[PDB]
Symmetry: C3
Subunit: 314 residues, 3 copies
């Protein structure tokens, strides 16, 4: 599979700053190399140079709006470019607010994309339902068409135009959803598989149904926004908003292995990896190594094994 | 759901004493508050004042019979009272021998109840099959009608009258059952799902079958006797009789989430939490926090989320 | 079930030496006793006295060929003897290269055996496809009939004669397979359940299908070659080639519990336990205790419980 790597060192979507080191630690772990070690065509577009917006006071409760809004705007253009070059966008991110730019830029070139959101949270709070004001918990609200006329003109987001409909997304791993968010899920009829559904059905059926839900009508590009906190913090401890009872390492790999096999992956986000939050050096490497493993499965690494189209017995 | 909290600081059903701190640590963790934070009507009936029975020598092999027998007798009356007030009894316990009083008091008001026992053990040894003599491993033997005329007149239990039939109970999580106990399971035909069945079927099917088994005929009040050692000790380490290979945090929450949804929960027991046995302070908080989470799911907290009957988008 | 214990203190199939202590630590953990505590007829044939072959230089890339080849030859004779005495061979091993001798000796007496290989690896590299040269990653290549004329005359293995066909074996737990190995799996059509299939189907269905695959045609003796690294290193850390995302303790016990119930277990291998590799004393006891538990389930220990054909209520 041919990838286009985009480093997105941004954190203003939430409090803790260490998340901007994500692209750094991931590359350092040998991500580019390992992808190449696989049948992958990799082009590194570098880390986006996000500038400091000194004058960025809160919009009502919303924090760092201009900073977050600009970073996604910049990211949107980069993703559209990589997509225009026939490459799967791989956004090594900071906080999940960048999904606004990633999914948006992706949709410019492929307006018919389906989104799969693996997270412990729905991140669908509106600037008016959020309680923390952190924009990494509001990305989905800006992207939904049905929520248009429900989001205030937030400084820094005028360039945004809702690109996905409530029926074009599936959540997997949910276990910490606010009341307002829950009301939105049920009101717009968004399809989700919280940890309760994973326990009931098994990750296998969850993926069967998820892929059926988005590809039944017809094949369409797939955007996978993966938040490392979707997995249990026993696997990805170095993250800002960990919630117990998460997806396992295996379930994480199963999900991505199944997405890969569709041959329809078009955009990928690996978010919220924050080294600065590992209680120990090992917790950092455990988080980074797991993040890398999920990324590799997205592009073909199979646990059963891989082999070239040659005769190994000769 | 409307609850009636009963603190049961008792431990004489087994060796280690720290179990009597259970009601204390659970309340301190904010149980009442958190339940209230939910759509719950909560009435705290306090911690039962168990008096010391200085003269309580062994009955054959059975230890602290009068002490254990009196505590359950006292608990039985409290549960019957809370049930008479139209409230779900929530027994924050010490050792599982208190189930004798909890299930018994519950059955006085609702003779048609079905019991769900989540434990690593069956606790169905008779005063004559037990090898340790600890009464927390014999509660079920006193409650079964079919075992009547098989239990010796144990000092302190003359007030007991078997209230449930072998067909009115289901075990979930079994992984440490004595030979005598196993013989009783098979002879009386008790329905159970040991860890082997959970692995084979998945917790989803286990709950489907469990609820079908007890509610198929007709709807009936449900008594859930939850022992924290039913879950793996990686989740609930601060307990006296931990057995490896237990139910997971998720499975624990799945079970209770499903029970809640029946709308038939009538009595709940949260037992065997012993702070004094945590190798570290964190093992104590891990055990207590998990115990609280299971309790909250019993009364509505859903991992997918919760929202009031209002318009959050306004 | 009647067992014939064989200690196989060998390690030259790989780099780390501590694996030869396996039979020692396992016996010390009380394996013989515990089996006896069960309805088991146990005869200890002792630990095979493996002599040092000072002159054993590499055959091409293959390391310690004569040493490894002799140990399996010696083991083959012992297994055939125990099988001739109507006893289930229980090989407490060192490295997995000994499977060559175990499966081979077993097949002399029972040419129609079916093999179940629980491992994180396939160990089916040929002396010409292996990259490390360690023979514990090549055992299966020597045993397959279809690979005959594909394996070089390796010094020390002239006594070998391929005994099993590609269709007579099933892999469970795979998660680290080389390209050459993968090509062999697909070319010979070997049946396997990598970690991806376990996640998709559940261990229950995996065992249903595995047993159906090997016993559908007709009943045949079963040889279970269990490598402790098939389970996740959170359960069996003291092993030389651990791979994350492995089978759980429960899945481990489920597998063996199901094999036992077939009443067809004929040969068992408990391999790769290396005490010298536990980061701590507890990691050693965790590894050994888990190895023992898997062994006990192989011969009847059930999590639901066990009882004799007597009246426990009398």
């Amino acid at each position: 599979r041919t990838i286009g790597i985009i480093g997105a060192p941004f954190s203003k979507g939430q409090p803790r700053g260490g998340v901007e080191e994500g692209p750094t630690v991931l590359r350092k772990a040998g991500l580019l190399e390992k992808l190449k070690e696989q049948e992958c065509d990799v082009k590194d577009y570098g880390d986006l140079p996000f500038a400091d917006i000194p004058n960025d006071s809160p919009f009502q409760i919303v924090k760092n709006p201009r900073s977050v809004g600009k970073a996604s705007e910049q990211l949107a253009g980069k993703v559209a470019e990589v997509k225009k070059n026939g490459r799967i966008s791989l956004v090594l991110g900071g906080d999940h607010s960048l999904a606004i730019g990633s999914i948006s830029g992706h949709a410019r070139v492929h307006p018919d994309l389906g989104v799969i959101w693996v997270d412990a949270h729905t991140d669908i709070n509106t600037p008016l339902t959020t309680t923390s004001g952190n924009l990494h918990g509001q990305p989905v609200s800006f992207l939904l068409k049905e929520l248009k006329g429900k989001i205030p003109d937030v400084p820094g987001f005028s360039w945004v135009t809702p690109c996905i409909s409530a029926k074009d997304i599936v959540y997997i791993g949910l276990r910490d959803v606010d009341p307002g968010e829950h009301y939105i899920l049920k009101t717009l009829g968004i399809k989700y598989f919280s940890m309760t559904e994973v326990d009931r059905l098994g990750i296998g059926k969850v993926m069967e149904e998820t892929l059926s839900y988005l590809l039944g009508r017809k094949k369409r590009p797939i955007h996978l926004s993966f938040d490392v906190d979707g997995l249990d913090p026993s696997f990805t401890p170095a993250t800002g908003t960990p919630v117990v009872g998460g997806l396992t390492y295996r379930e994480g790999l199963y999900i991505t292995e199944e997405i890969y096999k569709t041959g329809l992956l078009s955009g990928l986000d690996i978010m919220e990896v924050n080294p600065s939050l590992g209680k120990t050096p090992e917790e950092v490497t455990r988080t980074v190594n797991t993040a890398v493993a999920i990324t590799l499965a997205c592009f073909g690494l199979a646990r059963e094994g891989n082999h070239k189209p040659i005769d190994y017995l000769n």
